[PDB]
DNA sequence: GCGCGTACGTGCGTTTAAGCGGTGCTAGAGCTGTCTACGACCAATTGAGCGGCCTTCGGCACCGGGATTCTGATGGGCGGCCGCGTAT
C-alpha cells in the first residue's frame, strides 16, 4: 500500500510536467516525446525512445 | 546469546482479466501556404544606478542628586566599690 502512494506521487509530477507542454502545443494527444522531456526535468533522463 | 512468537514464503486450487491479433472510426498531429505583426538593429538623448563617502535620532544600559534612616560618642543622676584614712 505504501509504494502505490509514491508511485502515484511520481507519475503525478511527471505527467504534470508533461501535460503542460502538450497543452502548450495546442493539442491533446500528448506525445511519448513529452513523457521523456518531462522525465528529463525531474532529473530522470531516459535513453531509448526519443527525438 | 537465546528463546518465543508469529508472520510471511511456498503450494494448489479457484478465478478473474491481461494479452492477442481483428476491425472500425475519426481526431488530432503534421504538413502546408500565405500576412503581417513584433523583435532585432542603429541612432541620440536622458536619468537610473554604482562607487565614494560620511548622517542623525533612538534605544540598550550604564548613571545622578537629594531627603531620610541607622549607627556612634556624650552626660547628668541614682547606686554601689568595700577599703584606706583621719579624729577622739
Swiss-Prot record:
Post-translational modification note: Demethylation is performed by JMJD6. Monomethylation is performed by KMT5A/SET8. Trimethylation is performed by KMT5B and KMT5C and induces gene silencing.
Residues with PTM N6-succinyllysine: 26, 40
Modified residues (N6-acetyllysine): 8, 28, 40
Cross-link (Glycyl lysine isopeptide (Lys-Gly) (interchain with G-Cter in ubiquitin)): 40
Positions where N6-butyryllysine occurs in the chain: 26, 28, 40
Compartment list: Nucleus; Chromosome
Residues with PTM N6-propionyllysine: 26, 28, 40
Residues where N6-lactoyllysine is found: 26, 40
GO term, biological process aspect, one: nucleosome assembly
Keyword Nucleotide-binding annotated: no
A GO term from the CC aspect: nucleus
Family assignment from sequence similarity: Belongs to the histone H4 family.
Protein purpose: Core component of nucleosome. Nucleosomes wrap and compact DNA into chromatin, limiting DNA accessibility to the cellular machineries which require DNA as a template. Histones thereby play a central role in transcription regulation, DNA repair, DNA replication and chromosomal stability. DNA accessibility is regulated via a complex set of post-translational modifications of histones, also called histone code, and nucleosome remodeling.
Protein name, UniProt field: Histone H4
Residues of the full protein shown: 53 to 103 of 103
Amino acid at each position: 500500500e505504501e509504494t502505490r502512494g509514491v508511485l502515484k506521487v511520481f507519475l503525478e509530477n511527471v505527467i504534470r510536467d508533461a501535460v503542460t507542454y502538450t497543452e502548450h502545443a495546442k493539442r491533446k494527444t500528448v506525445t511519448a516525446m513529452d513523457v521523456v522531456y518531462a522525465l528529463k526535468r525531474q532529473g530522470r533522463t531516459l535513453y531509448g525512445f526519443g527525438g
